[PDB]
Design a protein around this ligand. Sequence first.
Ligand SMILES: O=C(O)CN(CCN(CC(=O)O)CC(=O)O)CC(=O)O
Length: 126
Amino acid sequence: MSAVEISPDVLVYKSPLTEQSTEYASISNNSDQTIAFKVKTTAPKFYCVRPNAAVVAPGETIQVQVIFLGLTEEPAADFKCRDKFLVITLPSPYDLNGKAVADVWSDLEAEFKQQAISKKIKVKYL
Ligand SMILES: O=C(O)CN(CCN(CC(=O)O)CC(=O)O)CC(=O)O
């Protein structure tokens, strides 16, 4: 029932792929209740995600930097990147009491995993 929007479907990193480059995702909370999101990276050695977990207020949009750290050599044109990012969103109706989102995410997940809104963002090279 949560009106949460996660975008985009595919993050596109352009050549040269031996150079650092930042793409951006977005999580928009169009519901009337604050949510919390976490981003899991399938290839953490090559990407840095900021923020990896945070709260989104009603009507707020959080842009997430996905920083590709580059590769040692340019890859083949036919090569198909298999890296993915799982964005998971949950209700966050309890005050964090100063703790971070990651610190509470285990309990929040154990409570609301059935109501989680998830999106798998793919990665392609260009
Ligand atoms: O996502 C956007 O709207 C902004 N994009 C649009 C332009 N993109 C296309 C893409 O994301 O595949 C790069 C480009 O084609 O120059 C810029 C970016 O990638 O940082």
